[PDB]
A paper describes a structure:
Two soluble lectins, LecA and LecB, involved in adherence and biofilm formation have been described in P. aeruginosa. These lectins act as virulence factors through their carbohydrate binding ability. LecA and LecB bind to galactose and fucose, respectively, and their glycan-binding spectra cover a wide range of antigens (ABH, Lewis, P and I systems) present on human tissues or bacterial cell walls. The crystal structure of LecBPA7 was resolved to investigate the incidence of some amino acids changes on the structural organization of the LecB tetramers and sugar binding site.
One crystal of LecBPA7 complexed with Lewisa tetrasaccharide diffracted to 1.75 Å resolution and the structure could be solved in the P21 space group, with one tetramer per asymmetric unit. All of 114 amino acids could be located in the electron density, as well as the 8 calcium ions (2 per sites). The whole tetrasaccharide was clearly visible in three sites, and only one reducing glucose was disordered in monomer D. The structure of the LecBPA7/Lewisa complex was compared to the one previously obtained for LecBPAO1/Lewisa complex. Both structures share the same overall organization with rmsd (root-mean-square deviation) of 0.4 Å over the 456 amino acids of the tetramer. When looking at the binding site, the fucose residue adopts the same orientation in both lectins. No amino acids change involved in calcium coordination or in the hydrogen bonding to fucose was recorded. The other two sugar residues of Lewisa, i.e., galactose and GlcNAc, present a slight shift in response to the amino acids changes and the modified network of bridging water molecules. In LecBPA7, Ser97 (that replaces Gly97 in LecBPAO1) establishes a hydrogen bond with one of the two structural water molecules that bridges between the glycan ligand and the protein surface. The other variation, i.e., Ala24Gly results in an additional hydrophobic contact with the methyl group of Ala24 close to the CH2 group at C6 of the GlcNAc residue.
Residue numbers in the entry:
A (entry chain C), B (entry chain D), C (entry chain B), D (entry chain A): 1 to 114
Amino acid sequence: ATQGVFTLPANTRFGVTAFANSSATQTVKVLVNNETAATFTGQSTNNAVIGSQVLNSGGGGKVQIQVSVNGRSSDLVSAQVILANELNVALVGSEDSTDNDYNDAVVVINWPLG
Amino acid sequence: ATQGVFTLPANTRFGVTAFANSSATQTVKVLVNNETAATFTGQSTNNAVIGSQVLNSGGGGKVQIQVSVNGRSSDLVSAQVILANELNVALVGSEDSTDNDYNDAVVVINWPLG
Amino acid sequence: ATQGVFTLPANTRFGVTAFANSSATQTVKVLVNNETAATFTGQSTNNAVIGSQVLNSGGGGKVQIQVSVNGRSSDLVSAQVILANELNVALVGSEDSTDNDYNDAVVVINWPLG
Amino acid sequence: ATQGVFTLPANTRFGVTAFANSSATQTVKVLVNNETAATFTGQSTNNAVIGSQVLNSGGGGKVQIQVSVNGRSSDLVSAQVILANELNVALVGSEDSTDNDYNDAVVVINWPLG
Ligand SMILES: *[C@@]1(O[C@@H]2[C@@H](O)[C@@H](O)O[C@H](CO)[C@@H]2O)O[C@H](CO)[C@@H](O[C@@H]2O[C@@H](C)[C@@H](O)[C@@H](O)[C@@H]2O)[C@H](O[C@@H]2O[C@H](CO)[C@H](O)[C@H](O)[C@H]2O)[C@H]1NC(C)=O
Ligand SMILES: CC(=O)N[C@H]1[C@H](O[C@@H]2[C@@H](O)[C@@H](O)O[C@H](CO)[C@@H]2O)O[C@H](CO)[C@@H](O[C@@H]2O[C@@H](C)[C@@H](O)[C@@H](O)[C@@H]2O)[C@@H]1O[C@@H]1O[C@H](CO)[C@H](O)[C@H](O)[C@H]1O
Ligand SMILES: CC(=O)N[C@H]1[C@H](O[C@@H]2[C@@H](O)[C@H](O)O[C@H](CO)[C@@H]2O)O[C@H](CO)[C@@H](O[C@@H]2O[C@@H](C)[C@@H](O)[C@@H](O)[C@@H]2O)[C@@H]1O[C@@H]1O[C@H](CO)[C@H](O)[C@H](O)[C@H]1O
Ligand SMILES: CC(=O)N[C@@H]1[C@@H](O[C@@H]2O[C@H](CO)[C@H](O)[C@H](O)[C@H]2O)[C@H](O[C@@H]2O[C@@H](C)[C@@H](O)[C@@H](O)[C@@H]2O)[C@@H](CO)O[C@H]1O
Ligand SMILES: [Ca+2]
Ligand SMILES: [Ca+2]
Ligand SMILES: [Ca+2]
Ligand SMILES: [Ca+2]
Ligand SMILES: [Ca+2]
Ligand SMILES: [Ca+2]
Ligand SMILES: [Ca+2]
Ligand SMILES: [Ca+2]
């Protein structure tokens, strides 16, 4: 299945944060309605925050996360959870190699804000 | 039910990060095996990171998140998700008031690291 | 926090299924827009299905699960998961006593159907 | 990423239940520590239960779900959630065609029982 794609309510502010855990530099692209809205780049094997920003889901509500390491697309896994019928958290793990920890870049998207 | 309490594998590094979305200053306490291991304090209505740290689950593996606003405990909601049978993300939402967005402080615990 | 309440898309068929794991007879009430739409009753300590039905979310979309044992409300925990950005599963655990396994009645709500 | 694979605590009873939502007959295989422990077969477009059984995770704790339709592997998505730090629900969605509802067979694994 396609992974890393989430439908948000239209015109809604959301947070996106990425963490790195890999010897390789991670490039995390955040596409909102098929346009790049943010790109986080960084290298850490200690869960450093490599980007954290507030974006707007726009008219189409489509948010997609892509992760690559020196031009090679990482394998993604993702899900969305809703807590108290209100707090939405979408999650993306990514694997740049063969050990399958899926933590090489970890991306958290949350809404609503404020 | 009790919320914000999670059992981790023993002696495992984990990340804990908190975001704020409230006019009130949030205090997030992280207890590892019933002792305070970190405290984050901060204010944002725009999902700012108010703390992000690497901790160790220790012998007992017990992690508890408590959130308060000027000494009053916030109500919590929480869940843990596992992706690719390996990537663990424990989530806490908290509510300091009456609107029930549960985003006043949002806490993300993730493991494994590295 | 309130638990066992979920917003579904309006006028959408959904499945609701309950499993029992308790010496006590479980009563599971499914409220759709604040009116009882189904009630399951049954006893098992082996995860037997005590009810499974298809319902319609109606105009309001509001689905609430309540669990009781001979008139006494069990304590509930819940969350909703979305997989492949399309498959929705809402989950309710319940505790009728003191051991906090939260499995005494387990309720699964899923959509879309068909 | 591989989907439909879950690590359970060793020697623990768990439930596995499958629902069908497709014009095609679904075959769900449950492998426990790499050996076939159950197979459910059925056809429904109305979320009927096509199998529900209690199994034991054995020494290794490895549970894998495979879904096929007339010999062809369906595409899977999955996740595990833990509620109240104790109730575990692993979920599998599957797609046998092109509409990507991922509900064609839906599999719920839960523990602990009793
Ligand atoms: C691996 O190196 C390979 C090279 O061996 C070669 O195959 O060329 C490829 C590029 O095509 C790689 O450069 O690179 C991985 C990152 O791309 C790296 O794994 C990642 O970082 C690790 C620290 C860890 O976080 C892992 O999850 C990440 O995917 C891998 O590092 C090694 O991973 C091992 C487990 O398989 C083990 O942890 C080693 O400690 C760690 O160094 C890396 N392997 C090597 C040998 O360089
Ligand atoms: C000794 C006993 O039967 N305990 C069960 C409990 O009984 C009380 C009874 O002692 C008296 O106080 O009246 C109460 C109602 O007013 C109640 O009947 O009833 C519990 C549920 O109502 C029951 O626990 C449930 O069933 C279990 C088998 C298990 O699935 C539990 O998770 C579930 O909540 C008590 O059963 C015992 O529970 C303990 C754990 O606390 C062990 O599982 C024992 O083996 C059970 O017999
Ligand atoms: C037209 C179509 O897509 N038909 C069903 C499809 O039939 C295939 C047949 O056209 C082709 O030549 O042979 C292949 C096997 O080699 C199929 O037999 O088969 C799939 C299941 O294999 C059906 O889709 C399933 O059942 C549906 C009712 C629904 O639950 C869907 O999610 C599921 O995957 C196809 O059924 C059609 O699906 C469409 C949506 O794509 C609508 O739901 C139609 O009403 C339905 O008939
Ligand atoms: C009247 C007042 O001072 N209310 C404070 C809350 O702020 C208002 O919340 C309401 C919603 O209830 C609404 O958003 C207003 O615009 C706010 O001024 C405040 O709530 C907390 O901060 C909010 C900005 C919002 O994030 C909310 O979810 C959060 O709980 C609480 C905090 O203690 O104080 C109230 O006195
Ligand atoms: Ca890796
Ligand atoms: Ca890694
Ligand atoms: Ca609030
Ligand atoms: Ca808020
Ligand atoms: Ca119980
Ligand atoms: Ca029980
Ligand atoms: Ca389908
Ligand atoms: Ca279908």
